Amino acid sequence: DPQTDTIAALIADVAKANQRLQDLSDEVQAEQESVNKAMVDVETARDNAAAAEDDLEVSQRAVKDANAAIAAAQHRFDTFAAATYMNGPSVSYLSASSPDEIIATVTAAKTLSASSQAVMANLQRARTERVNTESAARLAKQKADKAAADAKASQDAAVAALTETRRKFDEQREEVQRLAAERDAAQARLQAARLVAWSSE
């Protein structure tokens, strides 16, 4: 019969539509898991980038300190020399200096310079070590931000895939309801026809 084969086609169409809704549902769950996973990776990468920013800030502060140490030492030595000179035989000390006094004085001054240079060289070396660590930390930062940025991208993709799959699910759900109602109404019609057709036989 031409009827009973349109009912059969509808049984099949409703079955297909439901199977596809289910398959889209399973896809949704997998996208969901990938988005949740992607969000954990954003978080851990954000924390690593935060720790890298802290390292960098700490390293820059050590450099500022090293610089301050150099400025302070230079000033201490400059003050030492200036105080010695002001209270010395060229200024405040008015009495005669023998040849030996003069020689002691320049040798003291030469000694002070040599000592000052040795201390400053050490401070300059230390400063250099701080500038290096800052460079190291600045790069470890750049890597960490990059890594955080890449995690955000992965998340954004996973969010887009999931949103699209839910878009498909929603439309498939409408199709299912439509085919269901239509399959219902076809059987109803067929039944109705059978009752009428029997009522007169």
Short mmCIF file of all heavy atoms in Angstrom, two decimals, residues 51-104:
data_model
loop_
_atom_site.label_atom_id
_atom_site.label_comp_id
_atom_site.label_asym_id
_atom_site.label_seq_id
_atom_site.Cartn_x
_atom_site.Cartn_y
_atom_site.Cartn_z
N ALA A 51 54.07 34.32 38.20
CA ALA A 51 55.29 34.04 38.92
C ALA A 51 56.49 34.59 38.15
O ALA A 51 57.51 34.91 38.73
CB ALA A 51 55.44 32.55 39.16
N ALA A 52 56.35 34.71 36.84
CA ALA A 52 57.46 35.17 36.00
C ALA A 52 57.58 36.68 36.06
O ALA A 52 58.67 37.25 35.97
CB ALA A 52 57.26 34.72 34.58
N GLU A 53 56.43 37.33 36.20
CA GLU A 53 56.39 38.77 36.36
C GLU A 53 57.02 39.15 37.69
O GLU A 53 57.79 40.10 37.75
CB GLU A 53 54.94 39.27 36.28
CG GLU A 53 54.79 40.75 36.59
CD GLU A 53 55.58 41.63 35.64
OE1 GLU A 53 55.88 41.20 34.51
OE2 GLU A 53 55.91 42.78 36.03
N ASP A 54 56.71 38.39 38.74
CA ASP A 54 57.31 38.59 40.06
C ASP A 54 58.82 38.41 40.05
O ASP A 54 59.53 39.22 40.63
CB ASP A 54 56.69 37.63 41.09
CG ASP A 54 55.57 38.28 41.87
OD1 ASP A 54 55.84 39.27 42.59
OD2 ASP A 54 54.41 37.80 41.78
N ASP A 55 59.29 37.34 39.42
CA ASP A 55 60.73 37.13 39.26
C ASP A 55 61.36 38.35 38.60
O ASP A 55 62.42 38.82 39.00
CB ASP A 55 61.01 35.88 38.43
CG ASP A 55 60.67 34.59 39.16
OD1 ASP A 55 60.08 34.67 40.26
OD2 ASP A 55 60.96 33.49 38.63
N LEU A 56 60.70 38.87 37.57
CA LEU A 56 61.29 39.95 36.80
C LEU A 56 61.38 41.21 37.65
O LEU A 56 62.40 41.90 37.64
CB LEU A 56 60.49 40.21 35.52
CG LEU A 56 60.85 41.49 34.77
CD1 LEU A 56 62.32 41.50 34.37
CD2 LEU A 56 59.97 41.62 33.56
N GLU A 57 60.30 41.49 38.37
CA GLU A 57 60.22 42.68 39.21
C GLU A 57 61.26 42.61 40.33
O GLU A 57 61.92 43.60 40.64
CB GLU A 57 58.81 42.81 39.79
CG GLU A 57 57.74 43.12 38.74
CD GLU A 57 56.33 43.13 39.31
OE1 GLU A 57 56.17 42.72 40.48
OE2 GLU A 57 55.39 43.55 38.59
N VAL A 58 61.40 41.43 40.93
CA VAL A 58 62.42 41.19 41.93
C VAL A 58 63.81 41.43 41.34
O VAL A 58 64.68 41.99 42.00
CB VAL A 58 62.32 39.76 42.50
CG1 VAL A 58 63.62 39.35 43.17
CG2 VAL A 58 61.17 39.67 43.50
N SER A 59 64.03 41.01 40.09
CA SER A 59 65.37 41.12 39.54
C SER A 59 65.70 42.57 39.24
O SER A 59 66.85 43.00 39.37
CB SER A 59 65.51 40.24 38.29
OG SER A 59 64.81 40.80 37.19
N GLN A 60 64.69 43.34 38.86
CA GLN A 60 64.88 44.75 38.53
C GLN A 60 65.17 45.56 39.79
O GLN A 60 65.90 46.56 39.76
CB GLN A 60 63.64 45.32 37.84
CG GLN A 60 63.41 44.77 36.44
CD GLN A 60 62.07 45.19 35.88
OE1 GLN A 60 61.09 45.23 36.61
NE2 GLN A 60 62.03 45.52 34.60
N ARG A 61 64.57 45.12 40.88
CA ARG A 61 64.78 45.73 42.18
C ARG A 61 66.20 45.46 42.68
O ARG A 61 66.84 46.34 43.26
CB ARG A 61 63.74 45.20 43.15
CG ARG A 61 63.65 45.89 44.48
CD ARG A 61 62.37 45.41 45.13
NE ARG A 61 61.29 45.41 44.13
CZ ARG A 61 60.36 44.46 44.01
NH1 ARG A 61 60.34 43.41 44.81
NH2 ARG A 61 59.43 44.57 43.07
N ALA A 62 66.71 44.26 42.42
CA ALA A 62 68.09 43.95 42.77
C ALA A 62 69.08 44.83 41.98
O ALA A 62 70.13 45.22 42.50
CB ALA A 62 68.39 42.49 42.54
N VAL A 63 68.73 45.15 40.74
CA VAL A 63 69.59 46.00 39.94
C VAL A 63 69.58 47.42 40.50
O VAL A 63 70.63 48.06 40.64
CB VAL A 63 69.15 46.02 38.46
CG1 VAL A 63 69.79 47.19 37.73
CG2 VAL A 63 69.50 44.70 37.78
N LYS A 64 68.39 47.91 40.83
CA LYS A 64 68.25 49.24 41.40
C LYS A 64 69.07 49.31 42.67
O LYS A 64 69.75 50.31 42.92
CB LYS A 64 66.77 49.56 41.68
CG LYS A 64 66.55 50.94 42.29
CD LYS A 64 65.05 51.27 42.45
CE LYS A 64 64.45 51.80 41.14
NZ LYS A 64 62.99 52.15 41.24
N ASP A 65 69.04 48.24 43.47
CA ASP A 65 69.81 48.20 44.71
C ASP A 65 71.30 48.24 44.40
O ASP A 65 72.00 49.10 44.93
CB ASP A 65 69.48 46.95 45.52
CG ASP A 65 68.09 47.02 46.18
OD1 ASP A 65 67.29 47.92 45.83
OD2 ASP A 65 67.77 46.16 47.04
N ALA A 66 71.77 47.33 43.55
CA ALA A 66 73.16 47.32 43.11
C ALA A 66 73.63 48.71 42.66
O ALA A 66 74.74 49.14 43.00
CB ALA A 66 73.36 46.33 41.99
N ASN A 67 72.78 49.42 41.92
CA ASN A 67 73.14 50.76 41.47
C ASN A 67 73.27 51.73 42.63
O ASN A 67 74.17 52.59 42.64
CB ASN A 67 72.11 51.30 40.46
CG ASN A 67 72.28 50.70 39.07
OD1 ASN A 67 73.39 50.29 38.68
ND2 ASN A 67 71.19 50.65 38.31
N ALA A 68 72.36 51.60 43.59
CA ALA A 68 72.38 52.45 44.76
C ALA A 68 73.64 52.17 45.59
O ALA A 68 74.23 53.10 46.15
CB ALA A 68 71.13 52.25 45.58
N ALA A 69 74.06 50.91 45.64
CA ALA A 69 75.26 50.53 46.36
C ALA A 69 76.48 51.19 45.73
O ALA A 69 77.40 51.62 46.41
CB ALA A 69 75.43 49.04 46.39
N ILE A 70 76.50 51.26 44.41
CA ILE A 70 77.64 51.86 43.76
C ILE A 70 77.67 53.37 44.05
O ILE A 70 78.73 53.93 44.37
CB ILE A 70 77.61 51.57 42.25
CG1 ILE A 70 77.95 50.09 42.02
CG2 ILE A 70 78.59 52.45 41.49
CD1 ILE A 70 77.44 49.56 40.73
N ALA A 71 76.51 54.01 43.98
CA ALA A 71 76.42 55.45 44.22
C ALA A 71 76.81 55.81 45.65
O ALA A 71 77.41 56.84 45.91
CB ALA A 71 75.03 55.94 43.92
N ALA A 72 76.42 54.95 46.59
CA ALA A 72 76.69 55.18 47.99
C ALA A 72 78.17 55.02 48.27
O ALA A 72 78.78 55.87 48.89
CB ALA A 72 75.88 54.24 48.86
N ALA A 73 78.75 53.93 47.79
CA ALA A 73 80.17 53.71 48.00
C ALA A 73 81.00 54.83 47.40
O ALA A 73 81.96 55.29 48.01
CB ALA A 73 80.60 52.38 47.44
N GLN A 74 80.64 55.27 46.19
CA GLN A 74 81.38 56.34 45.56
C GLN A 74 81.35 57.60 46.43
O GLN A 74 82.36 58.28 46.60
CB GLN A 74 80.82 56.65 44.17
CG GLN A 74 81.56 57.78 43.45
CD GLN A 74 83.03 57.47 43.23
OE1 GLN A 74 83.89 57.84 44.04
NE2 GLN A 74 83.33 56.80 42.11
N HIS A 75 80.20 57.90 46.99
CA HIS A 75 80.03 59.04 47.84
C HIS A 75 80.76 58.96 49.19
O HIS A 75 81.22 59.92 49.69
CB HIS A 75 78.56 59.32 48.04
CG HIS A 75 78.26 60.31 49.10
ND1 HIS A 75 78.22 61.66 48.87
CD2 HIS A 75 78.03 60.15 50.42
CE1 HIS A 75 77.93 62.28 49.98
NE2 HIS A 75 77.84 61.38 50.94
N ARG A 76 80.83 57.78 49.74
CA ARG A 76 81.50 57.55 50.98
C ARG A 76 82.98 57.82 50.76
O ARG A 76 83.59 58.49 51.52
CB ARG A 76 81.26 56.15 51.44
CG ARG A 76 82.28 55.58 52.36
CD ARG A 76 81.82 54.26 52.95
NE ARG A 76 82.46 53.12 52.36
CZ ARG A 76 81.80 52.19 51.69
NH1 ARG A 76 80.49 52.28 51.53
NH2 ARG A 76 82.45 51.19 51.18
N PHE A 77 83.51 57.29 49.69
CA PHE A 77 84.89 57.47 49.39
C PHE A 77 85.20 58.93 49.07
O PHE A 77 86.17 59.43 49.50
CB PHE A 77 85.34 56.50 48.31
CG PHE A 77 85.46 55.08 48.79
CD1 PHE A 77 84.84 54.06 48.13
CD2 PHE A 77 86.21 54.77 49.89
CE1 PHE A 77 84.94 52.78 48.55
CE2 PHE A 77 86.32 53.48 50.33
CZ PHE A 77 85.69 52.47 49.65
N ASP A 78 84.32 59.58 48.33
CA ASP A 78 84.47 61.01 48.02
C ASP A 78 84.46 61.87 49.28
O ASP A 78 85.19 62.85 49.37
CB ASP A 78 83.36 61.46 47.06
CG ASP A 78 83.58 60.98 45.63
OD1 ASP A 78 84.64 60.38 45.37
OD2 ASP A 78 82.71 61.21 44.76
N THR A 79 83.63 61.50 50.25
CA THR A 79 83.52 62.20 51.53
C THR A 79 84.75 61.96 52.39
O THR A 79 85.34 62.89 52.96
CB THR A 79 82.25 61.76 52.29
OG1 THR A 79 81.10 62.22 51.57
CG2 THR A 79 82.17 62.38 53.67
N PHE A 80 85.14 60.70 52.51
CA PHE A 80 86.40 60.36 53.15
C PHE A 80 87.56 61.25 52.67
O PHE A 80 88.30 61.86 53.46
CB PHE A 80 86.78 58.91 52.84
CG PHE A 80 87.83 58.32 53.78
CD1 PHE A 80 87.71 57.00 54.24
CD2 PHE A 80 88.92 59.07 54.20
CE1 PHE A 80 88.66 56.43 55.07
CE2 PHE A 80 89.89 58.53 55.06
CZ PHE A 80 89.75 57.21 55.51
N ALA A 81 87.72 61.32 51.36
CA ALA A 81 88.82 62.07 50.76
C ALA A 81 88.65 63.55 51.02
O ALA A 81 89.62 64.23 51.33
CB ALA A 81 88.87 61.81 49.30
N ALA A 82 87.42 64.05 50.90
CA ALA A 82 87.16 65.48 51.07
C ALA A 82 87.35 65.90 52.53
O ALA A 82 87.92 66.95 52.80
CB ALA A 82 85.76 65.85 50.58
N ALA A 83 86.88 65.07 53.47
CA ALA A 83 87.08 65.36 54.89
C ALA A 83 88.56 65.36 55.25
O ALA A 83 89.04 66.23 55.98
CB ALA A 83 86.33 64.38 55.75
N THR A 84 89.28 64.37 54.74
CA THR A 84 90.72 64.29 55.00
C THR A 84 91.46 65.52 54.48
O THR A 84 92.33 66.08 55.16
CB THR A 84 91.30 63.04 54.37
OG1 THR A 84 90.61 61.89 54.89
CG2 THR A 84 92.81 62.94 54.66
N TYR A 85 91.10 65.94 53.28
CA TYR A 85 91.71 67.10 52.65
C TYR A 85 91.39 68.41 53.39
O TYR A 85 92.29 69.22 53.65
CB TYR A 85 91.24 67.18 51.20
CG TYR A 85 91.72 68.40 50.45
CD1 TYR A 85 93.04 68.48 49.99
CD2 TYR A 85 90.86 69.45 50.16
CE1 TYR A 85 93.48 69.58 49.27
CE2 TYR A 85 91.29 70.55 49.45
CZ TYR A 85 92.59 70.61 49.01
OH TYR A 85 93.03 71.71 48.30
N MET A 86 90.11 68.61 53.72
CA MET A 86 89.68 69.85 54.36
C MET A 86 90.35 70.05 55.71
O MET A 86 90.73 71.16 56.05
CB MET A 86 88.15 69.88 54.54
CG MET A 86 87.39 69.96 53.23
SD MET A 86 87.93 71.34 52.20
CE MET A 86 86.93 72.63 52.93
N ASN A 87 90.49 68.97 56.47
CA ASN A 87 91.16 69.04 57.77
C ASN A 87 92.67 68.86 57.64
O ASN A 87 93.37 68.84 58.65
CB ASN A 87 90.59 67.99 58.72
CG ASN A 87 89.12 68.20 59.01
OD1 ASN A 87 88.74 69.06 59.80
ND2 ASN A 87 88.27 67.41 58.36
N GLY A 88 93.16 68.75 56.40
CA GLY A 88 94.57 68.48 56.13
C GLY A 88 95.48 69.71 56.02
O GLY A 88 95.04 70.83 56.28
N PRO A 89 96.75 69.50 55.62
CA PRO A 89 97.75 70.58 55.54
C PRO A 89 97.51 71.59 54.40
O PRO A 89 98.01 72.71 54.47
CB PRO A 89 99.07 69.82 55.32
CG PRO A 89 98.76 68.38 55.63
CD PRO A 89 97.34 68.20 55.25
N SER A 90 96.75 71.20 53.37
CA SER A 90 96.39 72.14 52.30
C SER A 90 95.28 73.14 52.71
O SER A 90 95.09 74.16 52.04
CB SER A 90 95.93 71.37 51.05
OG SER A 90 96.87 70.38 50.66
N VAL A 91 94.55 72.85 53.80
CA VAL A 91 93.44 73.72 54.23
C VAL A 91 93.51 74.12 55.73
O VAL A 91 94.08 75.16 56.08
CB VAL A 91 92.07 73.07 53.94
CG1 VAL A 91 90.95 74.03 54.26
CG2 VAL A 91 91.96 72.64 52.47
N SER A 92 92.93 73.29 56.60
CA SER A 92 92.84 73.62 58.03
C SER A 92 94.14 73.43 58.82
O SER A 92 94.32 74.06 59.86
CB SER A 92 91.73 72.80 58.69
OG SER A 92 90.46 73.19 58.23
N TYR A 93 95.03 72.54 58.37
CA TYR A 93 96.26 72.33 59.12
C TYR A 93 97.33 73.31 58.66
O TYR A 93 97.84 73.23 57.53
CB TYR A 93 96.77 70.89 59.01
CG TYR A 93 97.95 70.65 59.92
CD1 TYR A 93 97.77 70.50 61.29
CD2 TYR A 93 99.25 70.60 59.42
CE1 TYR A 93 98.84 70.29 62.14
CE2 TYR A 93 100.33 70.39 60.26
CZ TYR A 93 100.12 70.23 61.61
OH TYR A 93 101.18 70.03 62.45
N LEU A 94 97.68 74.23 59.55
CA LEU A 94 98.40 75.44 59.18
C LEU A 94 99.91 75.34 59.44
O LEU A 94 100.70 76.07 58.84
CB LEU A 94 97.81 76.63 59.93
CG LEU A 94 96.29 76.79 59.77
CD1 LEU A 94 95.77 77.94 60.62
CD2 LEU A 94 95.93 76.99 58.30
N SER A 95 100.29 74.42 60.33
CA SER A 95 101.68 74.24 60.73
C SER A 95 102.53 73.63 59.60
O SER A 95 102.00 73.05 58.64
CB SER A 95 101.76 73.37 61.98
OG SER A 95 101.02 73.94 63.06
N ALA A 96 103.85 73.76 59.74
CA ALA A 96 104.78 73.29 58.72
C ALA A 96 104.69 71.77 58.53
O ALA A 96 104.50 71.02 59.50
CB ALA A 96 106.22 73.70 59.10
N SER A 97 104.81 71.33 57.28
CA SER A 97 104.96 69.90 56.97
C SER A 97 106.40 69.61 56.51
O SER A 97 106.90 70.25 55.58
CB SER A 97 103.96 69.44 55.90
OG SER A 97 102.64 69.33 56.41
N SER A 98 107.05 68.64 57.17
CA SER A 98 108.38 68.19 56.76
C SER A 98 108.29 67.46 55.41
O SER A 98 107.18 67.23 54.90
CB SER A 98 109.00 67.29 57.84
OG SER A 98 108.30 66.07 57.99
N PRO A 99 109.43 67.09 54.80
CA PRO A 99 109.31 66.27 53.59
C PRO A 99 108.62 64.93 53.84
O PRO A 99 107.88 64.47 52.97
CB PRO A 99 110.77 66.06 53.15
CG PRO A 99 111.62 66.47 54.34
CD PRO A 99 110.83 67.52 55.04
N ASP A 100 108.82 64.33 55.01
CA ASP A 100 108.22 63.04 55.32
C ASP A 100 106.70 63.11 55.50
O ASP A 100 105.99 62.19 55.10
CB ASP A 100 108.85 62.44 56.59
CG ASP A 100 110.30 61.99 56.37
OD1 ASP A 100 110.71 61.81 55.19
OD2 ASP A 100 111.02 61.83 57.38
N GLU A 101 106.21 64.19 56.11
CA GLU A 101 104.76 64.37 56.25
C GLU A 101 104.07 64.41 54.89
O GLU A 101 103.08 63.71 54.68
CB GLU A 101 104.45 65.65 57.02
CG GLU A 101 104.55 65.49 58.53
CD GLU A 101 104.84 66.81 59.22
OE1 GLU A 101 106.02 67.23 59.21
OE2 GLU A 101 103.89 67.44 59.74
N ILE A 102 104.60 65.22 53.98
CA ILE A 102 104.07 65.34 52.62
C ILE A 102 103.98 63.97 51.94
O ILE A 102 102.97 63.64 51.32
CB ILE A 102 104.94 66.27 51.76
CG1 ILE A 102 104.81 67.73 52.23
CG2 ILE A 102 104.57 66.16 50.29
CD1 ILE A 102 105.91 68.63 51.67
N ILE A 103 105.04 63.19 52.07
CA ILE A 103 105.10 61.88 51.44
C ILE A 103 104.08 60.94 52.06
O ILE A 103 103.46 60.16 51.37
CB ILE A 103 106.51 61.25 51.55
CG1 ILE A 103 107.55 62.16 50.90
CG2 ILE A 103 106.54 59.87 50.90
CD1 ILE A 103 109.00 61.71 51.13
N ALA A 104 103.92 61.01 53.38
CA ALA A 104 102.92 60.18 54.03
C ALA A 104 101.53 60.53 53.47
O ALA A 104 100.74 59.63 53.18
CB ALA A 104 102.95 60.35 55.54
#
